[PDB]
Design a protein around this motif. Sequence first.
Motif, PDB file in Angstrom:
ATOM      1  N   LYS A 112       0.837  -1.193   0.000  1.00 27.46           N
ATOM      2  CA  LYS A 112       0.000   0.000   0.000  1.00 27.46           C
ATOM      3  C   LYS A 112       0.875   1.248   0.000  1.00 27.46           C
ATOM      4  O   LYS A 112       1.736   1.413   0.867  1.00 27.46           O
ATOM      5  CB  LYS A 112      -0.928  -0.003   1.214  1.00 27.46           C
ATOM      6  CG  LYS A 112      -1.900   1.164   1.251  1.00 27.46           C
ATOM      7  CD  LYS A 112      -2.200   1.589   2.678  1.00 27.46           C
ATOM      8  CE  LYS A 112      -2.531   3.070   2.751  1.00 27.46           C
ATOM      9  NZ  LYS A 112      -1.348   3.917   2.433  1.00 27.46           N
ATOM     10  N   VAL A 149      -2.245   0.369  -5.199  1.00 27.12           N
ATOM     11  CA  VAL A 149      -1.650  -0.916  -4.842  1.00 27.12           C
ATOM     12  C   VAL A 149      -1.007  -1.522  -6.084  1.00 27.12           C
ATOM     13  O   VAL A 149      -1.248  -1.063  -7.206  1.00 27.12           O
ATOM     14  CB  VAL A 149      -2.684  -1.875  -4.220  1.00 27.12           C
ATOM     15  CG1 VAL A 149      -3.245  -1.288  -2.933  1.00 27.12           C
ATOM     16  CG2 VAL A 149      -3.796  -2.186  -5.207  1.00 27.12           C
ATOM     17  N   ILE A 150      -0.175  -2.538  -5.900  1.00 31.80           N
ATOM     18  CA  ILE A 150       0.723  -2.991  -6.956  1.00 31.80           C
ATOM     19  C   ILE A 150       0.065  -4.103  -7.760  1.00 31.80           C
ATOM     20  O   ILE A 150      -0.696  -4.922  -7.230  1.00 31.80           O
ATOM     21  CB  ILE A 150       2.069  -3.456  -6.365  1.00 31.80           C
ATOM     22  CG1 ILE A 150       1.871  -4.660  -5.442  1.00 31.80           C
ATOM     23  CG2 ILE A 150       2.743  -2.318  -5.616  1.00 31.80           C
ATOM     24  CD1 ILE A 150       3.163  -5.318  -5.011  1.00 31.80           C
ATOM     25  N   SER A 151       0.353  -4.113  -9.061  1.00 30.11           N
ATOM     26  CA  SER A 151       0.279  -5.305  -9.896  1.00 30.11           C
ATOM     27  C   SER A 151       1.609  -5.482 -10.614  1.00 30.11           C
ATOM     28  O   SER A 151       2.555  -4.727 -10.359  1.00 30.11           O
ATOM     29  CB  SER A 151      -0.874  -5.204 -10.895  1.00 30.11           C
ATOM     30  OG  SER A 151      -1.013  -6.401 -11.639  1.00 30.11           O
ATOM     31  N   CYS A 152       1.708  -6.460 -11.511  1.00 27.39           N
ATOM     32  CA  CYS A 152       2.876  -6.558 -12.369  1.00 27.39           C
ATOM     33  C   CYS A 152       2.470  -6.920 -13.789  1.00 27.39           C
ATOM     34  O   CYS A 152       1.440  -7.557 -14.022  1.00 27.39           O
ATOM     35  CB  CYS A 152       3.872  -7.596 -11.835  1.00 27.39           C
ATOM     36  SG  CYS A 152       3.475  -9.307 -12.263  1.00 27.39           S
ATOM     37  N   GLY A 153       3.304  -6.493 -14.736  1.00 28.82           N
ATOM     38  CA  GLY A 153       3.116  -6.761 -16.141  1.00 28.82           C
ATOM     39  C   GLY A 153       3.642  -8.117 -16.563  1.00 28.82           C
ATOM     40  O   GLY A 153       3.831  -9.025 -15.746  1.00 28.82           O
TER      41      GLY A 153
END
Length: 71
Positions: A61, A67-71
């Motif tokens: 956070k 908030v995080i994601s990834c590719g």
Amino acid sequence: NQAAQHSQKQSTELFQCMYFKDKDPATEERCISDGVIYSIRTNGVLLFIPRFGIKGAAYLKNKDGLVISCG
RNA sequence: UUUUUUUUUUUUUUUUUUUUUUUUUUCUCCUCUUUUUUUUUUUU
């Protein structure tokens, strides 16, 4: 002796803090580490570095709730 | 063939004294965040 202990601790901490000083961490190949965990907290899980030995609590956070994601 | 007279540079020296760096203003004032606080151990 306890004071001495704290002395070694924060002296080495300061010496490590300058290993990560201003000298550009963008093209010198001294940037990437790895990571395992040992304990979960409500914003970031405690991290560890087996190749240097440093600890510290991170954050998933962020201030803007992004908030995080990834590719 | 043209005589005689019209002073000049103030007088004075044989007086006592028992203090003391400086010196005289300016108000109350929101210290941000994983924590309890870790800790033996050995090589200096």
